[PDB]
Structure formats: structure tokens, C-alpha cells
């Protein structure tokens, strides 16, 4: 099941730009 | 960009997503942040250390301690405010020693002659 700490996701902690510095914003 | 003690982070405003975690470890309390159009991020430490980072990577490329005016206490060696000029080539900082300091980039430098701090992401800190 996925009822435990449903609002907490690993991706929320990972900085999106580390995989690609040139990411467009 | 936003900062708390030893922690500088970048955020995308269109969706509020964490973009990058800077190499701000051990820099202490950060009183001010500034970003110029060349992607230089400046962080002024309350300990009086000027930290310069590459905004996209979060890499700390330069550390430079300020010098307090004669007669100041050690605690007065503290950066309190900053702003880049309109061209981004001059950094203005106000400090606890009551002085204003103007910083500028070295024009004699080149990628090979002034490499700056090495790109060596510390795996020990789990901020990646």
C-alpha cells in the first residue's frame, strides 16, 4: 500500500537541475 | 535563490521546484544574496567571508575574506548587505565595520590562469 506518508516523496528533496545544469527556466 | 546558515538553494518560480543545492557547506550565517546576469551568485557571510558561486551548477568557485577597518572588533568583520551594479561587473557590499566595499572581477584572469576552486562535489553531504 501507499497510504503511509503519502505527501512525502523522494523527488521533492532532489534538486532538478543537478541532472542537467543547462535546464531552461 | 534563498539561503539559511550553510544552506543556499535555488528554486524555479513557475512551479516552486528545487533547482540546485549550492556548495554552501561551512559558510555559516548568510546575510545577503545577489545574482548578476553572468550567473554569478554572491553570498555574504556574517563571518565576513565573500562566497562566489556558479548559479547553474551551485559550485562555489571563490572564497574571499573581507578585512575590517582599523580599530574594528572581530565581530565587525561581517557582510550585511550587497547588490550588483546594473552591469553586474561591480559588487557593492555594506558591512558591520560601517564601510562600503566595491568588488570587481579581475580582467587579467582566464579559464586557465585563474581556474578557481576545483569542481569536486562532496558525496559525504547528502544534498544531491
Amino acid at each position: 500500500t501507499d497510504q503511509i506518508a503519502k505527501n512525502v516523496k523522494l523527488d521533492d528533496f532532489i534538486p532538478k537541475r543537478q541532472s542537467n545544469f543547462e535546464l531552461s527556466v | 535563490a534563498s539561503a539559511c546558515t550553510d544552506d543556499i538553494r535555488s528554486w524555479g518560480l513557475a512551479e516552486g521546484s528545487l533547482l540546485t543545492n549550492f556548495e554552501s557547506e561551512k559558510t555559516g550565517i548568510i546575510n545577503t544574496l545577489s545574482i548578476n546576469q553572468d550567473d554569478v551568485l554572491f553570498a555574504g557571510g556574517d563571518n565576513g567571508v565573500l562566497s562566489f558561486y556558479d548559479y547553474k551548477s551551485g559550485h562555489k568557485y571563490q572564497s574571499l575574506a573581507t578585512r575590517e577597518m582599523v580599530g574594528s572588533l572581530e565581530g565587525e568583520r561581517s557582510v550585511l548587505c550587497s547588490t550588483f551594479d546594473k552591469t553586474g561587473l561591480r559588487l557593492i557590499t555594506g558591512e558591520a565595520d560601517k564601510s562600503i566595499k566595491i568588488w570587481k572581477q579581475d580582467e587579467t584572469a582566464t579559464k586557465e590562469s585563474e581556474p578557481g576552486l576545483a569542481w569536486n562535489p562532496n558525496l559525504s553531504a547528502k544534498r544531491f
Binding site: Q3, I4, A5, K6, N7, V8 | -
Partner: protein, 49 residues
């Protein structure tokens, strides 16, 4: 201590589902506090779940 006291108050009166809802809120609010995870874990292990 406030979270722990509240969870214990809930468990002492056998309100296990209120305690569960509260422990889930605690780990959802402060997921980096190991004490809250260990509290939830030890509660469910005591119930052989």
C-alpha cells in the same frame, strides 16, 4: 515531546486508530525525525502488525 505525549495519550485510552492517524500526520509533517518513525514502528510491532 508534544507529538509523543499526544500519541501516548491516544494509545493509553486504547484509541489505536486515532493514534494511527496522528502518527501518520507526525511522519508526514516531520519525516526527518527518526523518533516519529520509530514510534510508529514500535506501535505497530506491539500489535503484531
Amino acid at each position: 515531546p508534544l507529538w509523543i505525549r499526544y500519541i501516548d495519550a491516544e494509545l493509553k485510552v486504547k484509541c489505536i486508530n486515532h493514534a494511527r492517524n496522528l502518527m501518520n500526520r507526525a511522519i508526514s509533517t516531520l519525516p526527518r525525525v527518526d523518533k516519529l518513525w520509530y514510534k510508529y514502528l514500535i506501535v505497530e510491532e506491539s500489535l503484531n502488525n
